[PDB]
Every structure is written in C-alpha cells, then in structure tokens.
C-alpha cells in the first residue's frame, strides 16, 4: 500500500509510495508535519510515487 524509504543517493530525501485512490493530500499533510518535526541536516524533501509499487 503506502511505503516510505530513504532515497538511495540523497540522505536528505526520502521516497514515498501512494497507491491508487489513496488520499495523496492527507499523505502529504503528514509528510510536511513530520518533515519539520525532525528534519535532516539539509532540506527535507520527499519523492511521491503514484501507484502501488509492491
């Protein structure tokens, strides 16, 4: 379903998978919240994938 994993090459970026029909906006909202709560050394970015990649 929804997955979250570190970016292979970008320590400051994570990868998020959002399956079809899922509320992307709600997923983003969470990411923006937690993205700032902690945060890496650099700027916190996420890559959003459309569809279940499992």
């Amino acid at each position: 379903g929804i997955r979250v994993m570190d970016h292979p090459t970008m320590p400051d970026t994570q990868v998020v998978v959002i399956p079809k029909s899922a509320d992307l906006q709600s997923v983003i909202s969470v990411l923006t919240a937690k993205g700032k709560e902690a945060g890496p050394q650099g700027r916190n970015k996420f890559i959003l994938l459309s569809g279940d990649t499992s």
Partner: peptide, 25 residues
C-alpha cells in the same frame, strides 16, 4: 530529475518540499 535545464523536474512522480510546505510538479 531531468538534466539539461534549470527546471530539473521529474519525468515521473512529484517532489515535496517540506521546508517551504510546497509541492513541485
């Protein structure tokens, strides 16, 4: 992200900037 321009967007998926709370398409 596609190289060859300043506007290095993705060819697939989106980039979420959680520092400026803005989604780049």
């Amino acid at each position: 992200a596609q190289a060859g321009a300043a506007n290095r967007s993705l060819t697939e998926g989106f980039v979420l900037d959680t520092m400026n709370d803005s989604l780049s398409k």
